[model samples]
Target: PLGDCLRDWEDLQQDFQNIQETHRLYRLKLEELTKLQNNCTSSITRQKKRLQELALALKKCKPSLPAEAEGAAQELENQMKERQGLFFDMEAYLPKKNGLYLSLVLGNVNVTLLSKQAKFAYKDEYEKFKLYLTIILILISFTCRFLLNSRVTDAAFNFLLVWYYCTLTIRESILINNGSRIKGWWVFHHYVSTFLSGVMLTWPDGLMYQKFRNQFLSFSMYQSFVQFLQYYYQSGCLYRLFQSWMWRGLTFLLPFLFFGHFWQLFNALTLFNLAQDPQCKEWQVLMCGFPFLLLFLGNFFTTLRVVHHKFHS
Candidate 1:
């Protein structure tokens, strides 16, 4: 038994080393991402400066022109090159067009731009993706439980429930570490979403719902005690297949996961909530109880304000 457990520990140690290596690679990739973000920002800044200079130059030559704002097209025809500096974001430093073998689009929809008419677009996209994935996972998970229910033992059921509880919260950990300020309320939202999905799906008949919640949660705590085992096991060949390719891909879809969680609030507001308050605010009901939606919107303006302070102030 001692040798058996040691062999397990040795296997886990290898998995953890693999996880550490993956983290190292991802960190390097994150640094590369930062550089890309900075370069685009700088490119946009130069274009803006050039646009302002061109306007100033036109103002200086106003007397030589017909009118202050008249025939701007004519002026542009003669002065396209005058603001060659004005097109860094578009003309020269086009990141999307520049094939670094990793060209990805990052602009055209960012909220911080003063000209951005559509606010909350990012939230909308993020939420939609989140909702889609949540629905899929819920269906898949629920189906998995449902199908397995007839064939498997209660012990097996217990094992899977324990597994679900014990394993992986990679996404939440990463975001919180990345300066997400609303962790308290957000985590509450997430847990509520997770529990609501998990509890109902784990036992539709409330079979184990009556007795298994504690066993399940306790398993989670115990797993945390040996969570390094997951990381350790991660270095293994089996882990490379499941943990890296499958689980990491799943983790990356985290935004959608939360969106689905948020959708829980939506489902409540729409149907389940309708049972209690029939005359609830109709348009507001459609809003899905998105707490601090306003705060989410304000962040875009706040981001631009940060850029403004950094550059202009």
Candidate 2:
């Protein structure tokens, strides 16, 4: 058991190391992608400015304008139309090639062109607000510490954890491009590792148990990194885009929302002290016995809900 614990800790360390690396890599990629997006926008702004300049010059110097000037202006108009097409294609109208293609296209453009507001959306304000209701309930759960004695709270925690994981894991999709994420060979390797590790560590007591040795270090790292990647970079930006200008007050409400309730449960349960207490016998029985039940049923239903939500959704 001692050796196993040490191994688990080592595996966790390696997993975290990968998480840090993936985070850095993903952040760099996101920055590059954002820069490319901005370039197109900046180009549009400059084009509009020059177009305005030409129009003003033409207006001011109206010498029954020369044919040469008229031809030049017409040519400029045609060029603007061509650029507009490229803009639409780059932005979203056409399928985007890989980031590499975008980089090549934007190579000469002022790097300033690559700085624009990240995409954001605030669609379904009330629905998002409902998540806040959940946040609040989670808070209430913490304050109501008496509630943590049984296996119910563990079930709830596992449910939510697995829910979040399952939800994010299965969501790696775009139109007709199913499981595009699992397609990334490097990413896939990590995810596979995490899955195996999860099976080894927490599989027995089900969701009730902590991981064993974190045997699948890379996999767990991949899973968590993908979660952060999706939320911090992808989903957050997407929501901002679709729901721009709606009240996303919840974004600010998160820190208070998550940790507050979490600590409540932590303090009330005093989970850290459970094993050391003289009352630990009952706690151990609860820990050992209840988690198995929670894990089995929780994972089963969670998977079912995922499948139901997934194919139907």
What lDDT, from 0 to 1, does candidate 2 have? Answer: 0.42
- State the TM-score for model 1: 0.26
Mind giving the per-residue lDDT tens digits that candidate 1 earns over 59-168? Answer: 67665756566677577745765555456324332322222211232223221322222323432343344444434434444443445443334444444443443222
lDDT of 1 at 26: 97
lDDT of 2 by residue, 1-313 (tens): 6999999999999999999998988988899977976686677667767876876786677556475657776676678678666654454432233333224444333221111221111223323543444454345345333343333444454344444433333222221121122343323333343343233334335322332112112222333333333234333555565443222433443444344334333332443343344542354434433333333344345445544664473
RMSD of each: 19.1, 22.6
Cα error, residue 35 of model 1, in Å, equals 3.2
* TM values, all candidates: 0.26, 0.24
Instruction: Mark the regions of model 1 whose C-alpha exceeds 4 Å error after superposition.
Output: 62-122, 125-313
Best candidate according to lDDT: 1
